[PDB]
Amino acid sequence: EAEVQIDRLITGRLQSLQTYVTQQLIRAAEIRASANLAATKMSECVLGQS
Amino acid sequence: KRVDFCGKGYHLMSFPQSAPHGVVFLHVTYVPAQEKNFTTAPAICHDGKAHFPREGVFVSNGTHWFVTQRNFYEPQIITTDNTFVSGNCDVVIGIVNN
Amino acid sequence: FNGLTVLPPLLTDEMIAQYTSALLAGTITSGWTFGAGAALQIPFAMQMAYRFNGIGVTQNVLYENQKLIANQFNSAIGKIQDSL
Ligand SMILES: *[C@@H]1O[C@H](CO)[C@@H](O[C@@H]2O[C@H](CO)[C@@H](O)[C@H](O)[C@H]2NC(C)=O)[C@H](O)[C@H]1NC(C)=O
Ligand SMILES: *[C@@H]1O[C@H](CO)[C@@H](O[C@@H]2O[C@H](CO)[C@@H](O)[C@H](O)[C@H]2NC(C)=O)[C@H](O)[C@H]1NC(C)=O
């Protein structure tokens, strides 16, 4: 029956970990978009005149 | 006109190409080289009046003064057709008589 | 730890500051030509003259009102430093 209990714990922690990973992916995509915008601004407004 | 958007340097033109799951650009760009050094000045005071360049910049190799464009070296004699006058010169810093 | 860990970044802060100082010294000394080929020296007067000529105002204004502009810029940078 310890195997039953361990199955319960494993499935619960698996859903928790999956949720964390998905949130991390979304936030990383947003930060990448912002970084691309910042790179464009630095390449355009600094090395020249806008 | 936006620098360093497409290419590296001044931009001229481009050609597209195909690919399996993408596109390929061949930007044709313009890059200067073989630089030289000269002595500059912001304006010239003549007859009490300050003269400024219409476009370009004043340069000199030591003995004579010329006006040239900003991205290439071509010398022209200073005349009253490529320069414009604006008042008298007493506050400009760097004037040189000629 | 307790299961998780935080890895260090590849670039340390000193290198970042070095990059920023390089860019800033380059844009002070050469203008914008250092973004295309080799950097060329240019005095800081006839760089602001070009920048005004870009936005429509002729270059007479800068060479006839230099001290006022210098004071304006110094006061502005002092104010932003104090506000921060
Ligand atoms: C700066 O360039 C000018 C333009 O060529 C030089 O002036 C000429 O010099 C040659 C020398 O062989 C003379 O034959 C010409 O009569 C000059 N032209 C004029 C309009 O004076 C000048 O010598 C150069 N200065 C230096 C230091 O090299
Ligand atoms: C450019 O040359 C002119 C002509 O000599 C200079 O004008 C005079 O220069 C003398 C020399 O210092 C002064 O004493 C006079 O007051 C100036 N004006 C007049 C009406 O004679 C002018 O100063 C020279 N420019 C520079 C920057 O030296």
Cα(C15)–Cα(C71) distance, rounded to whole angstroms? 33
Minimal-distance CA residue of chain C relative to A48: C32
CB count in 10 Å sphere of residue C62 = 19
Cα(A10)–Cα(A12) distance, rounded to whole angstroms? 5
Q: What is the dihedral of CA C17, C41, B41, C62, to 10 degrees?
A: -30
| Method of determination used here | cryo-EM
Q: What DSSP string runs through A23-43?
A: HHHHHHHHHHHHHHHHHHHHH
Minimal-distance CA residue of chain C relative to A46: C27
Enter the tokens of residue B32.
Answer: 């200067």
CA distance A43 to chain B (A): 7
- Give the CB-side neighbour count of residue C69, counting CA atoms within 13 A: 10
Which helix (H) or strand (E) segment holds residue A19: the answer is helix A2-45
Q: Chain A contacts of C23, Cβ < 8 Å?
A: 46
Q: Do A49 and C35 touch (CB under 8 A)?
A: no
Q: Chain B contacts of C36, Cβ < 8 Å?
A: 3, 8-10, 31-32
Q: What is the 3-state secondary structure (H, E, C) of chain B?
A: CCCCCCCCCEEEECCEECCCCCCEECCEEECCCCCCCCEECCCEEECCEEEEECCCEEEECCCCEEEECCCCCCCEECCCCCEEEEEECCCCCCCEEC
Q: Do C51 and A48 touch (CB under 8 A)?
A: no
Ligand 1 center from residue C69 Cα (angstroms): 39
Cα(B92)–Cα(C1) distance, rounded to whole angstroms? 67
Ligand 1 center from residue B63 Cα (angstroms): 8
Beta carbons of B14 and B26 less than 8 angstroms apart: yes
SS3 content of chain C, % helix, strand, coil (to 5): 65, 0, 35
Contacts of B49 (CB under 8 A, 6+ apart): B85, B87, B88, B89
